């Protein structure tokens with residue numbers, strides 16, 4: 585039985601520092617993973633409309649609630665609003681599909697998944713005849729206002745953002761009539777992309793950071809053989825052996841010691857358990873400085889390439 589440390593949000597809700605990520609996987613693979621996770625002691629599950637797999641997650645949580653394995657109040661469920669749904673009637677409609685598939689009556693956190701609004705319509709990745717993304721009418725600011733209504737109505741406990749730079753967080757924070765603040769910024773983070781200035785910024789504003797792709801997302805479709813490889817990184821493995829731990833566990837523990845929430849994904853039961861076995865060791869302050877020095881500003885997750893649209897987050901330094 586395991587329990588992740590709590591990270592307290594500006595709303596005083598407690599966010600488990602390790603969560604289970606839910607990257608697309610067939611078919612009931614993700615459902616069992618959620619079941620296995622809950623068994624092992626995970627309470628934080630990270631979800632997304634775009635994965636189109638949220639119903640599996642829903643079946644899993646439902647069954648474990650009836651089985652009496654877990655209660656709702658102890659689960660910490662996060663999902664996100666995809667950019668093609670920023671227009672106000674769409675926000676509510678996308679959210680409702682999320683909350684339905686998940687068979688919940690509320691989310692602990694609802695995130696803006698990406699800062700740039702995309703063309704509304706059937707496509708989730710609207711593109712021109714030349715491949716480039718098509719912008720939409722509503723902004724992330726427009727979306728946020730609709731999302732704040734969800735909080736007003738007790739459908740969501742707290743809001744946050746994902747893939748935001750500090751310039752975009754600044755715009756959100758300085759928005760007139762702002763009701764609710766982002767409790768987290770979920771972004772890619774690992775030793776090749778250490779996000780030092782952004783984490784500094786968020787924390788200075790009382791906004792937590794959630795590290796995604798902490799293992800380098802090896803299963804990403806667009807990987808290349810020469811794309812650097814965190815899990816196979818000899819200097820990571822060496823630090824691991826020193827603690828009698830796996831490379832994956834070191835990569836996870838790295839965020840924990842920076843006070844950064846982290847959501848490693850696995851549909852393999854042995855790995856799910858292993859990925860939460862990370863509160864029995866501690867990297868030395870010298871091991872942490874060594875890992876921090878691996879920063880090469882490499883993004884595994886930069887597929888969108890809507891660098892032509894307004895509010896592209898990765899143009900910013902941080």
Ligand SMILES: NC(=O)c1ccc[n+]([C@@H]2O[C@H](COP(=O)([O-])OP(=O)(O)OC[C@H]3O[C@@H](n4cnc5c(N)ncnc54)[C@H](OP(=O)(O)O)[C@@H]3O)[C@@H](O)[C@H]2O)c1
Pocket residue numbers: 604605606607608630631697746747770771795796797798799800801802803815830832833847848849850851852855856858859885
């Ligand atoms: N924009 C966003 O907000 C955003 C973007 C990307 C990801 N995310 C979230 O973050 C989560 C995690 O990121 P990710 O899925 O991109 O990549 P990740 O967690 O860095 O890596 C997942 C991959 O590593 C494998 N793996 C898991 N544990 C392992 C272990 N102990 N040893 C060796 N291999 C292991 C998994 O394989 P098996 O599953 O086959 O075990 C899977 O292929 C996602 O599921 C999603 O929830 C959010």
Ligand SMILES: O=C(O)c1ccccc1Nc1cccc(C(F)(F)F)c1
Pocket residue numbers: 607608632634635698805887888
């Ligand atoms: O997975 C995210 O959170 C994500 C975020 C921004 C851009 C792309 C993203 N990934 C994504 C989007 C659609 C389908 C799949 C895949 F099925 F490959 F997992 C992965």
